[PDB]
Amino acid sequence: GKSHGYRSRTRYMFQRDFRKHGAVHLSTYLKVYKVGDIVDIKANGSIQKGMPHKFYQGKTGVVYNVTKSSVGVIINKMVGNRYLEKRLNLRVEHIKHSKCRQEFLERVKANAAKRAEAKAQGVAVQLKRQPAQPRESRIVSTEGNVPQTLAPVPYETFI
Amino acid sequence: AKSKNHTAHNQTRKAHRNGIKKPKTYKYPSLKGVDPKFRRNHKHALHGTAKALAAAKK
Amino acid sequence: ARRPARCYRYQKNKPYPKSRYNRAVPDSKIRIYDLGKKKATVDEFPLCVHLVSNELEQLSSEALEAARICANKYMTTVSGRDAFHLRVRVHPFHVLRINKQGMRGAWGKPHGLAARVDIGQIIFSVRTKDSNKDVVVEGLRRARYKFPGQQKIILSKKWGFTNLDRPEYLKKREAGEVKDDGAFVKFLSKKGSLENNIREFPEYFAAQA
Amino acid sequence: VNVPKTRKTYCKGKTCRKHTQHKVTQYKAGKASLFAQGKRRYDRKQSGFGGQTKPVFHKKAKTTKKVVLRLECVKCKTRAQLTLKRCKHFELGGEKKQKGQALQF
Amino acid sequence: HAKVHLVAIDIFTGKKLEDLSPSTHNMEVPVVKRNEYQLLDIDDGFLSLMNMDGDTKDDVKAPEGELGDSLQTAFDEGKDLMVTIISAMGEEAAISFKEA
RNA sequence: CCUCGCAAGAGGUGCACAAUCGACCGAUCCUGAUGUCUUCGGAUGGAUUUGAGUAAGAGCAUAGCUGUUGGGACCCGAAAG
RNA sequence: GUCGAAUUUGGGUAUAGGGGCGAAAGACUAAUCGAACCAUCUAGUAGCUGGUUCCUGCCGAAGUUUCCCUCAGGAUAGCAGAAGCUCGUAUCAGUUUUAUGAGGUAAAGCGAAUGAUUAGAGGUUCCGGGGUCGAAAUGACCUUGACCUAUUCUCAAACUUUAAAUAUGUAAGAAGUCCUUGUUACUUAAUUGAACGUGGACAUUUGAAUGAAGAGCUUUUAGUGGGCCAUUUUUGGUAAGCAGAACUGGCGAUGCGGGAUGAACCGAACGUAGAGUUAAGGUGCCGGAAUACACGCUCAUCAGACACCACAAAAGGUGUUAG
RNA sequence: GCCCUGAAAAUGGAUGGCGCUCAAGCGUGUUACCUAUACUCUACCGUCAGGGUUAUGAUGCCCUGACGAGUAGGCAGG
RNA sequence: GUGAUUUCUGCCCAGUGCUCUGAAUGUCAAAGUGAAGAAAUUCAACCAAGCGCGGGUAAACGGCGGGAGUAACUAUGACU
RNA sequence: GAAGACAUUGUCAGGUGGGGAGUUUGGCUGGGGCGGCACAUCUGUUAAACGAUAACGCAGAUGUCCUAAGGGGGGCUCAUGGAGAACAGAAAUCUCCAGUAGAACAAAAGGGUAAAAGCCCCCUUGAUUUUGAUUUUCAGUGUGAAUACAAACCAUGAAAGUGUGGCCUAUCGAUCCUUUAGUCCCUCGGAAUUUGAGGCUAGAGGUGCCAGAAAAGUUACCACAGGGAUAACUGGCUUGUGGCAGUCAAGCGUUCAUAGCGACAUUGCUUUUUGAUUCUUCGAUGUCGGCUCUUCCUAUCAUACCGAAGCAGAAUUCGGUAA
RNA sequence: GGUUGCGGCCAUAUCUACCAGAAAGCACCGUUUCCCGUCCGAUCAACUGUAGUUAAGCUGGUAAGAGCCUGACCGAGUAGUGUAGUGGGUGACCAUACGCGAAACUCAGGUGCUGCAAUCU
Numbered sequence A: 001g002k003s004h005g006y007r008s009r010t011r012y013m014f015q016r017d018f019r020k021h022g023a024v025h026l027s028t029y030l031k032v033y034k035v036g037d038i039v040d041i042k043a044n045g046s047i048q049k050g051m052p053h054k055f056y057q058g059k060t061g062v063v064y065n066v067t068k069s070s071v072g073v074i075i076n077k078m079v080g081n082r083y084l085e086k087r088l089n090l091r092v093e094h095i096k097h098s099k100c101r102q103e104f105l106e107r108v109k110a111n112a113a114k115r116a117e118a119k120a121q122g123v124a125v126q127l128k129r130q131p132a133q134p135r136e137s138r139i140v141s142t143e144g145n146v147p148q149t150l151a152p153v154p155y156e157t158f159i
Numbered sequence B: 001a002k003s004k005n006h007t008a009h010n011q012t013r014k015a016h017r018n019g020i021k022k023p024k025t026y027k028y029p030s031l032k033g034v035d036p037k038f039r040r041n042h043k044h045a046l047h048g049t050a051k052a053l054a055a056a057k058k
Numbered sequence C: 001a002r003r004p005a006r007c008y009r010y011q012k013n014k015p016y017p018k019s020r021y022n023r024a025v026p027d028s029k030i031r032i033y034d035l036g037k038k039k040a041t042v043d044e045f046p047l048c049v050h051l052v053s054n055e056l057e058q059l060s061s062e063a064l065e066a067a068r069i070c071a072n073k074y075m076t077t078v079s080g081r082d083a084f085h086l087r088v089r090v091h092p093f094h095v096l097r098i099n100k101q102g103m104r105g106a107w108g109k110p111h112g113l114a115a116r117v118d119i120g121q122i123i124f125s126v127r128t129k130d131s132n133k134d135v136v137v138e139g140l141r142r143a144r145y146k147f148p149g150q151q152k153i154i155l156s157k158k159w160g161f162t163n164l165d166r167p168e169y170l171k172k173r174e175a176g177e178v179k180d181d182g183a184f185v186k187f188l189s190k191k192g193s194l195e196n197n198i199r200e201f202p203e204y205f206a207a208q209a
Numbered sequence D: 001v002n003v004p005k006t007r008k009t010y011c012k013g014k015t016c017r018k019h020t021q022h023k024v025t026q027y028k029a030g031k032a033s034l035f036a037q038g039k040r041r042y043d044r045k046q047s048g049f050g051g052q053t054k055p056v057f058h059k060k061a062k063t064t065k066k067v068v069l070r071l072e073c074v075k076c077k078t079r080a081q082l083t084l085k086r087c088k089h090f091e092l093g094g095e096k097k098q099k100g101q102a103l104q105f
Numbered sequence E: 001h002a003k004v005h006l007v008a009i010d011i012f013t014g015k016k017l018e019d020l021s022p023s024t025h026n027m028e029v030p031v032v033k034r035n036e037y038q039l040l041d042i043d044d045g046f047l048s049l050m051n052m053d054g055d056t057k058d059d060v061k062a063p064e065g066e067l068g069d070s071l072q073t074a075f076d077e078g079k080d081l082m083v084t085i086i087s088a089m090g091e092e093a094a095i096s097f098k099e100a
Numbered sequence F: 001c002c003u004c005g006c007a008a009g010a011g012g013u014g015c016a017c018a019a020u021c022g023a024c025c026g027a028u029c030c031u032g033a034u035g036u037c038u039u040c041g042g043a044u045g046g047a048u049u050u051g052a053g054u055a056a057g058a059g060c061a062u063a064g065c066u067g068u069u070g071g072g073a074c075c076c077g078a079a080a081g
Numbered sequence G: 001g002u003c004g005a006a007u008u009u010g011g012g013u014a015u016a017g018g019g020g021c022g023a024a025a026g027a028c029u030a031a032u033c034g035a036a037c038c039a040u041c042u043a044g045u046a047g048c049u050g051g052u053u054c055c056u057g058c059c060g061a062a063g064u065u066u067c068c069c070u071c072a073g074g075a076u077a078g079c080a081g082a083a084g085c086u087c088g089u090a091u092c093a094g095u096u097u098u099a100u101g102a103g104g105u106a107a108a109g110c111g112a113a114u115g116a117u118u119a120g121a122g123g124u125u126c127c128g129g130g131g132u133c134g135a136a137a138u139g140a141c142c143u144u145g146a147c148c149u150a151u152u153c154u155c156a157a158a159c160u161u162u163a164a165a166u167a168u169g170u171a172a173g174a175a176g177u178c179c180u181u182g183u184u185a186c187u188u189a190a191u192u193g194a195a196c197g198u199g200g201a202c203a204u205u206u207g208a209a210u211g212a213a214g215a216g217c218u219u220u221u222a223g224u225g226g227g228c229c230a231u232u233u234u235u236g237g238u239a240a241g242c243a244g245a246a247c248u249g250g251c252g253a254u255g256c257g258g259g260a261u262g263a264a265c266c267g268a269a270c271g272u273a274g275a276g277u278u279a280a281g282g283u284g285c286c287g288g289a290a291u292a293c294a295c296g297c298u299c300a301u302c303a304g305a306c307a308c309c310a311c312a313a314a315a316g317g318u319g320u321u322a323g
Numbered sequence H: 001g002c003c004c005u006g007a008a009a010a011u012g013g014a015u016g017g018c019g020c021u022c023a024a025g026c027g028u029g030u031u032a033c034c035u036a037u038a039c040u041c042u043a044c045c046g047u048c049a050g051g052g053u054u055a056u057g058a059u060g061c062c063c064u065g066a067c068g069a070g071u072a073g074g075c076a077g078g
Numbered sequence I: 001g002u003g004a005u006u007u008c009u010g011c012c013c014a015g016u017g018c019u020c021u022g023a024a025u026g027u028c029a030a031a032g033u034g035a036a037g038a039a040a041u042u043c044a045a046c047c048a049a050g051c052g053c054g055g056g057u058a059a060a061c062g063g064c065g066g067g068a069g070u071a072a073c074u075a076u077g078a079c080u
Numbered sequence J: 001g002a003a004g005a006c007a008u009u010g011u012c013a014g015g016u017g018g019g020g021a022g023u024u025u026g027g028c029u030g031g032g033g034c035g036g037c038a039c040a041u042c043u044g045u046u047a048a049a050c051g052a053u054a055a056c057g058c059a060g061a062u063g064u065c066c067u068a069a070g071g072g073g074g075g076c077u078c079a080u081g082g083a084g085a086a087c088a089g090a091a092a093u094c095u096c097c098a099g100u101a102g103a104a105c106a107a108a109a110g111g112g113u114a115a116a117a118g119c120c121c122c123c124u125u126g127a128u129u130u131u132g133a134u135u136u137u138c139a140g141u142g143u144g145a146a147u148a149c150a151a152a153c154c155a156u157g158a159a160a161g162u163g164u165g166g167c168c169u170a171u172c173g174a175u176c177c178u179u180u181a182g183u184c185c186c187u188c189g190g191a192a193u194u195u196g197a198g199g200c201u202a203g204a205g206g207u208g209c210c211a212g213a214a215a216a217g218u219u220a221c222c223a224c225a226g227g228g229a230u231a232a233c234u235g236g237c238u239u240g241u242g243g244c245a246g247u248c249a250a251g252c253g254u255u256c257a258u259a260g261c262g263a264c265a266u267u268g269c270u271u272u273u274u275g276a277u278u279c280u281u282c283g284a285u286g287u288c289g290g291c292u293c294u295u296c297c298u299a300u301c302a303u304a305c306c307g308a309a310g311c312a313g314a315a316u317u318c319g320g321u322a323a
Numbered sequence K: 001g002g003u004u005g006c007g008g009c010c011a012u013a014u015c016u017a018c019c020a021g022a023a024a025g026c027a028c029c030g031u032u033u034c035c036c037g038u039c040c041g042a043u044c045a046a047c048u049g050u051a052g053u054u055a056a057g058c059u060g061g062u063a064a065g066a067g068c069c070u071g072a073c074c075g076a077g078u079a080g081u082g083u084a085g086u087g088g089g090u091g092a093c094c095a096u097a098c099g100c101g102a103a104a105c106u107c108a109g110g111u112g113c114u115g116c117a118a119u120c121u
């Protein structure tokens, strides 16, 4: 009566995108993963071998093993009162890189640069990010912009 | 004698009463499941590196 | 038999239509959806009158048919048969279920059909000439007597059934970009091919009156 | 299901650790000899008064048995067992099917 | 609860056999196979039979009833037939003749 | 803990313990040297294998709380054999 | 009812417990009989019922997962207490931001696919069906279907191009980055790469916010494993103080002020006193607090009076008020 | 909008009751006032944490701060 | 077993029982017999009653259905 | 006098043997029973856009099949439609054009696939050996299924590569006992050799109640421990059904909607029926009807006083105040 | 700037109809001896670059083109949705407060960009 298979409730999850069926592309085949990289798991439905479980769809982990056609990803999952580490063997079509990780690398390069100049001219660095400070004092010109008065509209039915 | 079948009430409260804190990562994680080819090479490379450092230290 | 619309009134279940998973359902009581001179033109019938809902509910298919008859009978008896076009704008697609020991195996057989109506959804639409406002309003008053809930008779200021309120429809027609189809019209857009736009609308692409 | 009488598969023998030719037979169970320790224990336990002492199986539910093939290598005469799934019908070396032959009702 | 009383006829001998069981218990059901063969000639009690292409089936005893006697009369005046044979739990028997 | 420094720190040694890679012992699967009574012996070397192991011992005895099991087993209670 | 026999009755005698005896009722067998009474095994067993003895202090639940001839019970994980131990050295969060993912629910769509579906318009010199024109027509004039083209009305838990909000994954360096060069049986055409390294550089912002009434770990063991209610989402049902789920909070286990009264609603959680101020609710009297102030509506020959909540609808009214 | 008709249940009967009609009803607004074991301040009791202290108690004496509900249950002191 | 007297007790031996001078071992234990072996043992035949095959018995237990066509009103069906 | 090495008797073996003895006679469940399997599994939905998630919710399916329908490689494009070609027509075969998949991929549903995963052809046996790691259900146990490697040996292909059965999600099984395969292995404990037996490593024989007892009923003669976790009264919530009353008004009523009715609808009330539920009660509320007796309601049968009529009178019908 | 070979993103590139292409390249093209392959030198294999052609392929342009892509203060702060109230309403449901925020529609623009190597009036 009740079923929990490997791909139960995975209809729209393992569907392809619209006008995106067919062969998967050689950029996703030629990207390189080295041990320590951080990758995002989103399953591709065309390649049935090496597919992850539905729990790991859209999930981020650290690659620990790189082999012939797959990579091994460590994912923390929440069961009970503890997180468990899971070691998945997923193929490179289901594995993609993490744009948060590349932007973090560009930010550490920019920070290293900024500290390098700030040390060269002897000025304090101001390196860490600050959140959105509220606002500052401002002047607005009425010249060419006289405030137009708005009033609430009456009720007219359109149907 | 019908009864209640399944309920997820209070489960999140018990879990967060003793929370989920962390998997407690370390430096040098375990090499369980890495490729045996290049695991053997890792063994020999570390042996050679230790011997080279000891020989340079004298 | 014949349970009340008060026990089938509110929208409580998901829409349950006739599909490959739900067969052997009975056919609805309403079969005809357009009455009056249904071949007339929007140039013939300018004024629109709408009977619209104000509650989220379920109208019975047979309530639709009963109100359709009483309306059409009153309009035909008073103003003749060719003075109006009545179109019912809701279709009964929700299959309503009846149970008929205990609550074991309580999923029921199909009983009837119903149309789910939303707040601000038109139930009845009548297009007619300007002189027949009183008879159209009275006929839809009989229709709202026979439907459940609270409904509103609104004077729709669109030329006929279509769109494009009366000054706008005038400007389009004496501009000439409106072509008379059977019981509706076709419009000229500035996005089609020039060749078929010429051979479909010569009056706009001529110097005619 | 149809399986051929011959099969080139791996041989465990120390003189031939490569793929060698094997003849394919079926494992028929042994004679169930009388002097096995469990049989002697059963005879002593059933002897006397008390009736039947160990359970006897009644609620058979499965019809099929897994077929297991006995492979004998043609060079070293060593044997192996390969398990094939539940099949109702089984033919060692039946006629090969024909792709597109004239059907004959 | 309800219990089932079954009255059945053994087909190979034609003998009445009865049974009584609780309606929730399991019962063995024989996997009978009915096959439609061609009769070549009625030899010394052991009818010769033909498959779709093959021709082994030479073991079925010619049916001793009046059905088999009328079958013998048919084959004796020729009028070639196809006969229907049942196979079940190791035993096979000709049950019904049919003119082709 | 030690050395320098009034310091903030810089270095050295780092018990217990934690993580990890090794090394050794038994089992398993191989590898099969000198000899050989010609079928024994098992050297040397391994291995995504495995153990309740080693890696400068911690145990023994008594007593106590609590928990377990068997005993009537916290007390009372059957229809029965 | 029967009353001279298949009668009644005394004494003696015989039959003894899975046995006797029975003109049969499972009757009778010492007030005991569908298996007597006594003693022993025996304090038989019980997942079931009842009881379970002094005080105070501190901490404090669960009715959920999996398996079991399992559903009135156990085992196991969880929740709790205690004993602590290693550090109190850069470690975390029922939280937000910044960056980056994932999803196909609400909505929306059908002149976009699938399925449903109302109505006309035009066309097919290709007869699908019924005709007519000279019984003729492998001919015209047609009706009528069908099909196509462009429109049109309405939908879809097991339809979808698009696609939210709320929840959800990861990261925010010192276990990091950069530069030369050491090992390897891995890898490469290769002094190329991969992994781990040596050495050197990286301070009044070691690289978002806010908090930390400490962080981490281990052992042991109890009770529990009948739950119930409320807001929102939702399934079956006509509906239910009905049955079953999801998130959260409560009651159980919880008094106190208010809802007259109430396990759950509102407020607020509790050592013992004093003073002050409030919450929710109130201020004619019962009853502590304005028969306060202000602007209007309503007269009921069934007025109305405060959430949960302890009921009222369709339809009407030259009652009155406003538009 | 309010009110009226629709509007019928069985002991006597319930805006809580009395009662209320420019209300003590309804809608909205401005203040004043009432009081909870809640909050603030103080005292005292206990527990926890951090500390200070080399003639009659050093598991003692003292200082500082926080906290205190509770069934099944666990532990401690009597 | 039925239950005075009077009258009668119909049909069915497939099932289940019961029974027999029915038939051949089809199956058939222990002991006994033969072959192989170094023996433990293994495999054969022979194999009693019984079971199976056959017959009888219902004042043994018991059972005793349908469906069509068919007669000058129609309707039913003596009949098939 | 009769029988006579027969029979009796003693011990084994087969049959028969409810006469007798033990024991059993699943679970879930809107009470239990019958039914069904929601008991081991798989797909879509419920499921509320991570995961998880219930009901005897909905729509279905499994206990098979295949030496090819497994593996590799190559050539081609599939449903469908149009135009044509003797017999030949709607449809037999052949072409051409269009043809994003509307076909097929063993089976249920979903997903996936176009110089293929489809259809034909060639070669094959990766449906192989040794154990490990990981994912799913999960206690992070087992079973099943699957994933990625390693050391071999192979298949295919020119090669890159691919292949550890079925394109993916299902197609299945512990201890004990029996049997088979492996080395030429260990033991039979006074010492040897052969058969025999017991071991180690991997399979099979099967437990569908699918973490796996060997198992028919009846009890109204019944018994015990319990249970309001659970049924048969009453009460309670609900009102489908029963009953009663409205709103609208096609029509009947000679014409005339509304004197009287009133179809198609639709809005309510009652607990005077039967359901639905299982909140109270199983250490007991005496469970139908009748007799007797009191009170209450009004949804008025009669009586009092009135209104309407298709009310001339008489009789009658509808309604009001009224219990 | 073309063209070829190999490609990346995979319609801004596709589809329909019509025009243009000087050079080189590509293509169509000619033959069956060999290797090879078919029912068939049509595909495939081989040989020549000669006998010819830009007719097609290909490339580019045009179309108030279909489609696709981008944007908008167009629709629309709308539908929807978190959180709150002793808010409203008999209910269905709705409004407000603090936040987030679509899709269709309308309109405007666009119709492949690019990497390596070789060759070209």
Ligand SMILES: C[NH+](C)c1cc(NC(=O)CNC(C)(C)C)c(O)c2c1C[C@H]1C[C@H]3[C@H]([NH+](C)C)C(O)=C(C(N)=O)C(=O)[C@@]3(O)C(O)=C1C2=O
Pocket: F009, G089, G090, G091
């Ligand atoms: C600021 N100090 C008090 C400090 C604090 C923490 N931890 C915290 O930040 C506080 N922890 C919270 C955040 C509250 C959980 C700290 O964690 C530390 C330290 C000190 C450093 C000192 C380091 C130092 N050198 C490298 C600059 C040094 O001299 C040594 C050494 N060579 O022995 C250290 O011990 C030092 O490396 C060290 O360990 C420190 C900390 O870890």
Ligand SMILES: C[NH+](C)c1cc(NC(=O)CNC(C)(C)C)c(O)c2c1C[C@H]1C[C@H]3[C@H]([NH+](C)C)C(O)=C(C(N)=O)C(=O)[C@@]3(O)C(O)=C1C2=O
Pocket: G090, G174, G175, G203, G206
């Ligand atoms: C991020 N900050 C809080 C930090 C973190 C860690 N550790 C980590 O990154 C986290 N630990 C992991 C590796 C994840 C396990 C850290 O380990 C440190 C520090 C702080 C530094 C500051 C150092 C500093 N430098 C410039 C010399 C400095 O001025 C001194 C000094 N000489 O006084 C330090 O104390 C400093 O050396 C120091 O101790 C730091 C850390 O060690």
Ligand SMILES: C[NH+](C)c1cc(NC(=O)CNC(C)(C)C)c(O)c2c1C[C@H]1C[C@H]3[C@H]([NH+](C)C)C(O)=C(C(N)=O)C(=O)[C@@]3(O)C(O)=C1C2=O
Pocket: I021, I023, I024, I025
């Ligand atoms: C049961 N035995 C004791 C027996 C008894 C009788 N007659 C009696 O009733 C004895 N009465 C007497 C002593 C004559 C006064 C008998 O009459 C018989 C039999 C045996 C049968 C056996 C039959 C058997 N099969 C066919 C079952 C069989 O194999 C044989 C044979 N060929 O050896 C027979 O003898 C048999 O067929 C048979 O005839 C028997 C008797 O006649």
Ligand SMILES: C[NH+](C)c1cc(NC(=O)CNC(C)(C)C)c(O)c2c1C[C@H]1C[C@H]3[C@H]([NH+](C)C)C(O)=C(C(N)=O)C(=O)[C@@]3(O)C(O)=C1C2=O
Pocket: I021
């Ligand atoms: C009718 N009688 C004459 C008989 C005949 C035969 N033989 C046949 O039927 C042979 N005829 C064939 C052809 C087989 C059909 C019989 O075979 C038999 C019997 C009867 C019994 C005799 C039995 C007797 N007992 C009762 C004391 C006897 O002497 C012995 C014995 N001690 O050997 C029996 O066993 C006996 O029971 C027996 O076996 C008979 C028959 O079978």
Ligand SMILES: [Mg+2]
Pocket: G089
């Ligand atoms: Mg430190």
Ligand SMILES: [Mg+2]
Pocket: none
């Ligand atoms: Mg440091």
Ligand SMILES: [Zn+2]
Pocket: D011, D012, D013, D016, D020, D073, D074, D075, D076, D077, D078
């Ligand atoms: Zn071999």
